[PDB]
Design a binder for this molecule. Structure first.
Ligand code: FE
Length: 204
């Protein structure tokens, strides 16, 4: 948690998430790879939604390129370990958040940037736990290297919000969406193999 950063998340991950992720590292890693790729797809999709925004393109093209470089790095690790890039099912988290995004412009854009930001903040928080806590050195080095290529204070998605919206508006909407994000992570994991980067486990 760097100072002069914005707090995105309304609650930290639970001890038990971390324990579960260490217990089934393969599932978490496969899922992580899909998440990186999904994160690039979101950046691109937002450009396709706002195709004449040069400020958005200047920010989200490099981000997409970086998310694919992270995907390639996770896939290299899976491949170095002999783990198949399996079609492992995604948790309900992303679909649940995206269902909060309003249908009309321009509030749809605000909501989309905030959801994208929430997802990345949660990935970040959990990747940082794994980087510090995992007993597997190669995972600590992957997760450390992926978080290194950063220096995020506000979050790219926050700055995009500020381009088009006052804080007076951003702030109360992020509070609402941050509340749904923690409700999406509430619950208990039904089987160990269901652990994911965005499976349940927060402290309330
Ligand atoms: Fe990434």
């Amino acid at each position: 948690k760097p100072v002069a950063s914005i707090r995105w998340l309304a609650a930290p991950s639970s001890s038990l998430w971390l324990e579960q992720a260490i217990n089934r590292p393969d599932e978490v890693l496969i899922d992580h790879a899909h998440c990186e790729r999904k994160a690039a797809g979101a950046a691109l999709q937002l450009m396709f939604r706002y195709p004449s925004s040069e400020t958005l393109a200047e920010a989200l093209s490099p981000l997409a390129q970086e998310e694919l470089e992270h995907f390639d790095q996770v896939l290299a690790l899976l491949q170095r370990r002999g783990i198949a890039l399996r079609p492992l099912p995604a948790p309900a988290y992303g679909s649940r958040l995206a269902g909060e995004i309003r249908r009309q412009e321009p509030l749809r854009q605000l909501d989309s940037f905030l959801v994208a930001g929430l997802i990345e903040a949660r990935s970040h928080e959990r990747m940082a736990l794994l980087a510090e806590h995992s007993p597997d050195p190669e995972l600590r080095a992957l997760y450390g290297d992926l978080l290194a290529s950063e220096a995020r204070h506000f979050g790219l998605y926050w700055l995009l919000c500020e381009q088009h919206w006052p804080r007076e508006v951003i702030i109360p909407r992020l509070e609402q969406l941050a509340a749904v994000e923690v409700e999406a992570l509430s619950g208990e994991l039904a089987r160990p193999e269901d652990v994911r980067m965005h499976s349940v486990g927060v402290q309330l």
